[PDB]
């Protein structure tokens, strides 16, 4: 009858899940950038 109930939880649930994907991606990217950059210094220092 009321379509309103089932619509408005579905599209709040969809946002919760997308927002889970967001902070998972925005983290793995970072961790690799940090590790890349640590070792760059370890090459910069090693030769010097």
């Amino acid at each position: 009858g009321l379509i309103k109930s089932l619509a408005e939880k579905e599209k709040q649930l969809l946002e919760r899940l997308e927002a889970a994907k967001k902070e998972a991606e925005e983290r793995v990217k970072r961790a690799e950038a940090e590790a890349k950059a640590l070792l760059e210094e370890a090459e910069a220092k090693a030769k010097a």
Binding site: Q12, A20, A24, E34, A35
Partner: protein, 62 residues
Amino acid sequence: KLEAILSQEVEAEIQALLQEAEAKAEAVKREAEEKAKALLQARERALEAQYRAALRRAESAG
């Protein structure tokens, strides 16, 4: 009613997960610091040997 709130019971499980993987994004970095570090302990000792060796040779030559 729980509707908007219905979604915060998931956002709390799926926040538990995301913290468990920011407890692995710390562990990974620990091991990688302990790796990067050890590659320069080997760098330190091997050079030290080659400097002990270079002055000893140059003394026997002298």
